[PDB]
Design a binder for this molecule. Structure first.
Ligand SMILES: [Cl-]
Ligand SMILES: [Mg+2]
Ligand SMILES: [Mg+2]
Lengths: 241, 240, 238, 239
C-alpha cells in the first residue's frame, strides 16, 4: 500500500475514467473524496472504495464553480483529515465541425475541461505547498497532442490542459508538488459510438484503453517524486508526443 | 507581388505583431482590412498600408464578440470585394502565479486569445470554402509549445490555439483552405523585467520582430501544401 | 510479484541505470539475464539479483556485435527457460562541439546507442512475436527530445532511439508486444552534469531506481506502446 | 534577388528534392555548387542553373566520405569564390520490417542520411563561423517526427538529423549561422508504399521539390529562425 495514510480527491470520480483512477488509488491505500454531479453514481463508487477497506467522502461539485471547488478541498481536509493527491478528471465532449460549433459548445467544453482544471488546481495549492509534498494529476486526452477534426473545441480545451499542466509543474517544481497529465486514447463512453468505433481502427493496437489503465498511470505519478510536467499517453500507440 | 488581387483581414492589426503582418502582406500585394480596438492606431496603420499602394479598410472589432467578428468578414467582402487570408493576431497577456490568478485573468486571456480565434475562423469558413482557396493564419506563441511559469493561463490559451489550428486544418484539408499558426518567441511589448530575462534564454540572445512574423505569414499565404503547422520564430528557444 | 515467472534481459545491466532497472524488475519477480562488458560488475550485480531470491544469468556482450546479441537471446531461452522483457540500456557519451567531433566520436556513440538498440530489438523479436506477448524497453535520454550543444552526436543517437522505438512499436502493435523508451534526465562530464542541473526545474538529479520504476510500469502495461517517457524533474515534456 | 552574391552547396542536388532546392535558390540569386553521384543529372541540372543566369559548379561527392565532403566545401570557395548556404539533401530509403532489416540496410541509411549530414555540416563550420553569417539547411523527413512501420531504420536516421540540427543550431546561435531542417512529407515497392502513405495526408496529394525549395529559401532569408524542423506535408504531422 504505497499510498497508505494519503488522501486523494478525484473530480469526475463517480464513473468512467475518474472511477477507474479512484479505485486504483484506493486499492493502493488512499482514502478518497469523490467529486461529481451524479448522486447515485457517487454513492455506488463510494461503496466500492469502502469495499477496498478505505474511507470515502462524496462531494457534489460543478468544477466550473470556484466556490464549490474550494469547498471540495475544504471537505477533504475536514472529512478525511488531509489531502495529498488531486485528480482533475471532470470532462465533457461533443462532436461538431467548426462551421457548426455554437458559442455554447465552445464555452461548455473549455469551461469544464480547462477552466475546471485551473480552478481545481488553484484550490489545492495553498495546502499542498504548505505540506511540502503533493501530486496534481490532470486528465487531458490524446486530443491534447493532436488536433481532431470535428473536435476542434475539444482539442483546444485539452491542449490547454496539457500546457497548463506543464506551466504549473514549473511553478511548483521547488515546492515538492508534482504536476502531470494523463492522456487517454479511446476509452469507450449513435454518432459518438460510430466515431469511437472508427477511431479504434486508427489505434495501432486496434483496441480501446480502460479506466484501470488510466488508474495505473495515476498511481505511477502519485509515487514518482522525480517525474513532473509530463503528459503521458495511454493510447495503444496512437501518438507519442 | 505574390498576393496581387487578394484581400487579407488582420485582427490586432493596428499595432505590434499584427501591424507587422499587415504591412508585410500589403507589401506583397494584398489589400488589407485592419481590425482592432485602437482608433488612432487603426488610422495610422491604414495610412501605412495605403502608402504601400494598397487599399485599406478598418473595423473596430472586439474579437470576443461573434456579431462584430461576423460584421468584420462581411465588411471585407463589401468594402474590398473579397477575402483570401484571415490572420488572427488579437492577443492579451498577464503575468501571475496560478495561486494569484483570478477567474477574470483566466477568462480574459482564454476568451481573447483562444475563443476570439475560434470566432474569427468560424466567421470566415463559409466564404473561404466556397471559393475553394483560403489561408487562415493564427498567431499563437512559443508559450503554446512550452508551459511558462507565471503564465500558465496564457500558455493554456496559446496551447489551445495550436491545437485548434491543427484540428481545423484537418477539417478544411480537402476544401483548399490551409490553416497554420505563427509562434512568436519574444517580441518586445514586471513585463519589461520578464521580457529582458527571457532574452537570456533565447539561444540567439535577441528578440524577434513583427517583420519576422510577417515573413512567416507571407510564407503560409503562399504555400498550398503546408497546413496544420505551428512554426516557431523564436531564435531557437523551442523547436517543438 | 507482477513479473513472477518472467525473464528479462538487461543490456548494460551491470552498473548505473541498467543495474537499477535489473534490480527493480528482479524485485518485481523477474529472473534476469545481465548483459555487459564488465566482468566483476556483472558478477556483483548477479549476486544482488540472487539476493532478491531470483535466478540470474550473465553474458559478456558488445551490443554493436550482432552475433553476441543473438547469442544473448539464445542464452536467455536456454539458461532461464524463456524471455519476456528486453531492456536495451547500453549507452555511451562524449562531449565535443561539432567542430571538434571526429568520425570515431560519431560512430562510437551512434553504433552503441542506436545500432546496439536496433540489434537487441531485432534479436528478441521472433521469440516475443511467436509467443504473442512481450515488452521491449529502450533507454534513450532527454537528449533524444532536445538537441544538446556539444552533444550533437549524442542527441542524434538518442533521437534515433526515440524514432526507432515508435516505429517498431507500430510494427508489433497487433502482436502483443509493446515497445517503449525511458528518457532519463541527469543521473549522477561531472562539470557538465552539474551545469545541466540548472536546467532541471526540480534542481536535483534522477536515479537508477527512478528508471527502474518506469521500466516496471512499461513491463506491466499492455496498452501503452510507442511512448518515450521523460523521467527528468521537469526538463522537457515532449 | 534576395540571395544575390551568395553561394549555396546542395548535396544530392542533381535530382528530386535537391534539384528543386537548387533551382529555387538559384532563381533567388545564388550561385550553386551541385554535389551528387549522378554524372548526367549533374550536367543537366547545372545547365538549368546557368539558364537562370547563375553560375554553377559540379562536384562528384559521396557524402559518407569526409575527404570528399571537405573537398566539396573547398571547391565552392575556389570555383564560386565563397559559401553562404549549405543544403544537405543526400538521402536514401529502403522498406523492411525490423525483423527483416540487415546491418547493411541499417548502416546504409544511417551513414548516408545522418552521418553524411554531420560530415557536411562539420566541413562548412569553420568558414561560415569565420564570416559571421551562414545558413545550414538539412533535409530530414516527416519520418523524423513520427516512427514509420517498415521504415524503423529510415526513421531512426531522420530523427537523428532533426536532433543533430537542433543541437548544432544551439552551438552556432551566437555565430550568425542558422541551422534548420526541412521535413518533406511524400514527394513523387517504394511507389506502392507512397500511394498508401497518401491516405495519411489530409490534403490527399503529394508535395513537390519546389515546395521544399520554397522552405529552403525561407530559412535562407530568415535571420531569427534557427533550430527548427518544419514539415511540408499536407498536414500529416505538426510536431
Ligand atoms: Cl476494444
Ligand atoms: Mg516548500
Ligand atoms: Mg471545395
Amino acid at each position: 500500500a504505497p499510498l497508505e495514510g494519503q488522501v486523494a480527491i478525484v473530480t469526475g470520480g463517480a464513473r468512467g475514467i475518474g472511477r477507474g483512477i479512484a479505485l486504483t488509488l484506493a486499492g493502493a491505500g488512499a482514502n478518497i473524496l469523490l467529486a461529481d454531479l451524479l448522486d447515485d453514481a457517487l454513492d455506488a463508487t463510494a461503496r466500492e472504495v469502502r469495499a477496498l477497506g478505505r474511507r470515502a467522502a462524496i462531494a457534489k461539485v460543478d468544477v466550473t464553480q470556484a466556490a464549490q471547488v474550494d469547498a471540495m478541498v475544504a471537505q477533504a481536509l475536514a472529512d478525511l483529515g488531509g489531502l495529498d493527491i488531486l485528480v482533475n478528471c471532470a470532462g465533457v465532449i461533443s462532436i461538431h465541425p467548426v462551421a457548426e460549433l455554437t458559442e455554447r459548445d465552445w464555452d461548455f467544453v473549455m469551461n469544464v475541461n480547462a477552466k475546471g482544471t485551473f480552478l481545481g488546481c488553484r484550490a489545492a495549492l495553498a495546502h499542498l505547498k504548505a505540506q511540502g509534498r503533493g501530486r496534481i494529476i490532470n486528465v487531458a486526452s490524446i486530443a491534447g497532442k493532436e488536433g481532431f477534426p470535428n473536435l476542434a473545441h475539444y482539442s483546444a480545451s485539452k491542449f490547454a490542459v496539457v500546457g497548463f499542466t506543464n506551466a504549473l509543474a514549473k511553478e511548483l517544481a521547488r515546492d515538492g508538488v508534482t504536476v502531470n497529465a494523463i492522456c487517454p486514447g479511446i476509452v469507450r463512453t449513435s454518432v459518438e459510438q460510430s466515431w469511437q468505433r472508427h477511431q479504434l481502427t486508427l489505434i495501432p493496437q486496434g483496441r480501446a484503453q480502460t479506466p484501470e489503465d488510466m488508474g495505473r498511470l495515476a498511481l505511477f505519478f502519485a509515487t514518482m517524486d522525480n517525474v513532473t510536467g509530463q503528459a503521458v499517453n495511454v493510447d495503444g500507440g496512437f501518438t507519442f508526443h
